[model samples]
Target: GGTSKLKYVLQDARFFLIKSNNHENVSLAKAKGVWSTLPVNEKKLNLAFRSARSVILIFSVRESGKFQGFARLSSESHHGGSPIHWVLPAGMSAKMLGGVFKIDWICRRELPFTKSAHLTNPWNEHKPVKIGRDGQEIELECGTQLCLLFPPDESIDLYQVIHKMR
Candidate 1:
């Protein structure tokens, strides 16, 4: 079926987190470990992009609980062994790491690990309703580490947060 265009508000957005050891892993721009398990719904994702002031794909070092860096969502593909991939803007590209383009590192900071309580594990049998904003439902795999960061009054200004890191 053809997709219909729809407008979304902050309440309809879902921010995805990708765990990485450092900048190099995130620079690959490929969520190799969990890409295959991610739920692919262009419609819902488009809504997220349109609703959020900016969709920053956050990369964190789960073990160290540190923020590695983030990337702007450029595009996505559902093909190949790693069927799902989050592409970054061409302007942000640098030299290749293997066959994929390595995103230039930008910012880093200490992660507020306590906030993980708000994150949802899509790989689990039972999903938490708290992670996503009120709107159409989008299922994510536990491995996806898809999390929600909303409530207009309490949401952080992502742009400003990145600015401070720079």
Candidate 2:
């Protein structure tokens, strides 16, 4: 559990994604695909939003890949839809899901402010973090993944999203 510290405020219309699975964020909301990999096991990495901030981490990439898991997002809310608390590599696997995830990198950020800033690796902010367990928990780890796109669209780019995959 190295870089798994987070705290949010400043919505700015909301925007954040640290994805590593869930089918490349559902094939980037559909429009053509071809970039897959999601082997990791234990089958339990779900999320929900709308008033529950957000956080999910599931670790084990060492051999030089880092970050453990768990960062109790305000005690795992369920105000509008949430389940599968958190589980992955917690042990006992006889084939159920474990390791593969192929991600070609995608980043979009903005959730830092004087609103009591506190982030460890919220997609490379890399600050001095170590606040977990009661500190409003936010140490999300593992292969790392987070999402929140509320109203943030910043006028799309990446060459029209790679020209819509040809």
Candidate 3:
């Protein structure tokens, strides 16, 4: 259970993007990648997009460095679909996630969410944290960076552990 080259870079069938595994400039007519220093304000950028359209996951924040705001994680279909998973916490999940920053990705379009408005950061308010279901081995919230579309040739063996909140 030791491998770290998270991969998936499709740019069709509604477009796709996910990188790790040394991440060498993802392509397919330009996907994009950045894990810059890593700190993303309030943290908790958990996501696992599904189909039916409107699976926004855009981010662009940089503090003491530039930019300043923008963060999103919009989904529909009762908030889960086709194995879709989500869990974005910290500052209650928006309001730019709240402070520390150093992230990037300014453009992405496959169009959905009513033809794409792609602007989220309004008033965030949440209440849901179950993780997996009865077993509960699917929790996310500690320094989150969980991007899943599961594809690294699909051998499937993803597991990350770091707990301390007691």
Candidate 4:
């Protein structure tokens, strides 16, 4: 019977990757301070962030190549302005904070050329990568570029990678 059968439940949540070029903001996030003010629009992208279960914050330093560090989102995007607010999760130790994982670990496969393009010169261009189960393209406001993970399974696999790190 349906009531007696065992069922496996999976979360229908999506994860996002945000790139930050500002050292100050990255520093604040590393210290678990109030790091906010992303270039995303409040009206458009705010809800997207709010709906997501978590977001991966990737830091990019000028001297070093991208993938300097990765931080997890603690709260949803809030405040209202040209740039919105996103925070780091609380009760995190130094190991869990930032600069822990390698790029190869987070991005298992060679990212598609379209997504890898901005990675080389992230300063010139900033785009967000969305990992979803459907692998469907999402509509965004003009000037917003999104990179999607292929085959959908990568999203779940990436979650496992993050879980192992934790």
Q: All models: lDDT?
A: 0.36, 0.26, 0.22, 0.33
After superposition, candidate 3 runs with Cα above 4 Å error: 1-48, 64-120, 125-166
Worst 10 residues of 2 by lDDT: 1-10
Report the C-alpha lDDT of model 3 over 92-160, residue by residue, as the tens digit: 332322222222222332222222222221211221211111111112321012222211222222221
Model 3, position 103: C-alpha lDDT score: 21
TM-score of each: 0.33, 0.21, 0.19, 0.35
Model 4 CA RMSD to the hidden true structure, in angstroms: 12.8
Tens digits of per-residue lDDT for model 2, 1-166: 0111122221221222223322232334222211111332111222232343432322212221222222221222222232222223345242333222222112232223222233354434454332221112233441122322111334333344333323
Per-residue alpha-carbon lDDT of candidate 4 for residues 1-166, written as tens digits (9 for 90 to 100): 1111101011232323344444454555554423443233222234544665433433343333333343334444433423313333354332222222112123222234344343322322433322211112222321122222221223334444445434
Order of the predicted models by TM-score, top scorer first: 4, 1, 2, 3
lDDT tens per residue, model 1, 1-166: 0001101111233445544334444444433322211233344444565565534344565355444443443333233333223442343232111122112122333345554455544533345423332122434432123322311212334444335424
Pick the TM-score winner: 4
RMSD of each: 12.3, 13.3, 17.2, 12.8
How many Å off is the CA of 41 in candidate 2?
Answer: 7.7
Question: Where is model 1 poorest over a 10-residue stretch in terms of lDDT?
Answer: 1-10
Ranking, lDDT, top scorer first: 1, 4, 2, 3
Q: Which stretches of candidate 1 lie over 4 Å from their true place?
A: 1-11, 26-56, 77-108, 118-166
What does the lDDT read for residue 147 in candidate 3?
27
